[PDB]
Amino acid sequence: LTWHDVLAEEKQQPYFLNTLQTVASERQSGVTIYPPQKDVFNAFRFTELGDVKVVILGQDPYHGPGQAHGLAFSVRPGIAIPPSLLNMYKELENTIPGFTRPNHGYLESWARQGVLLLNTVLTVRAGQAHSHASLGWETFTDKVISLINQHREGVVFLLWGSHAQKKGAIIDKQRHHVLKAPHPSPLSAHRGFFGCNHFVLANQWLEQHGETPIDWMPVLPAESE
Fold first, then answer.
1. What would you measure as the largest C-alpha separation in the chain, in angstroms?
2. Could you tell me if 56 and 91 are in contact, meaning their C-beta atoms sit under 8 angstroms apart?
3. Which domains does the chain have, with CATH numbers?
4. Lower CB density within 10 Å: C or N end of the chain?
5. H, E, C per residue of the chain
């Protein structure tokens, strides 16, 4: 089963298609929407349903130019690393042996290892956090989490912040592995994100069940001649 297999019906529902209509309208009404339409579903492009190993929930896409490109917490090459991602990198440096501060914030290489970087809201108006929160995206990502819970086995969920925690509140804690911490945002990171030991902990779960660990040092696409 692929994502389209299990979401094809869901994507024919009016809530979902009305959501896309609204986005498509706002893009043509003098408002910039992030990320670009071709990137909205990049988390699904880069880690297929059967490849999901670790799910990390974000909430809103980043709302500045060059930041959002369809992966929770990630930014494009050449963009400054946002404070939430810098705090994640700090926890990584304090816990993953050999890890050092990346010089970029691009996390595609996580996604390609089975890390589903899923924002619960998949678009946003430029400069206006949460501006599409009351469209249909939360409904859609509810269904996505529900399908991973049902169709997959042994997934680690990293739930950061009250919003993400609620969002995954009914995941099967037997068949899957749920880890909670406050959010890596500067407003909450010292309240429990630091010391959470989620990157190591996820890897040990994976290893325990015979799966390979995530290489958490993210890498940029290379150059060709």
1. 52
2. no
3. 1-225 (3.40.470.10)
4. C
5. CCHHHHHCCHHHCHHHHHHHHHHHHHHCCCCCEECCHHHCCHHHHHCCHHHCCEEEEECCCCCCCCCCCCCCCCCCCCCCCCHHHHHHHHHHHHHCCCCCCCCCCCCHHHHCCCEEEEECCCCEECCECCCCCCCCHHHHHHHHHHHHHHHCCCCEEEEECHHHHHHCCCCCCCCCEEEEECCCCCCCHHHCCCCCCHHHHHHHHHHHCCCCCCCCCCCCCCCCC
Q: Which residues contact 113 (CB under 8 A, 6 or more apart)?
A: 53, 214, 215
| Nearest Cα to Cα of residue 44 among 145, 188, 195, 183 | 145
Q: Decide: residue 75, CB within 10 A, 0-12 exposed, 13-18 middle, 19+ buried.
A: buried
Which experimental approach was used here? X-ray
Distance CA(71)–CA(37), nearest Å, equals 13
- Tokens matching residue 129: 């956090």
Spatial distance between the Cα atoms of 180 and 159, rounded to a whole number of angstroms: 5
Q: Is 116 exposed, middle or buried (0-12, 13-18, 19+ CB in 10 A)?
A: buried
Name the resolution in angstroms: 1.6
Cβ neighbours, 10 Å, residue 145: 20
Name the nearest CA neighbour of 22 among 125, 143, 135, 137.
135
What tokens were used for 25? 């309208």
Catalytic residue among 60, 142, 172, 215: 60
Give dist(CA 177, CA 186) in Å, integer.
Answer: 26
Q: For residue 63, what are its two tokens?
A: 């709302």
Cis peptide upstream of residue 213 (ω within 30 degrees of 0): no
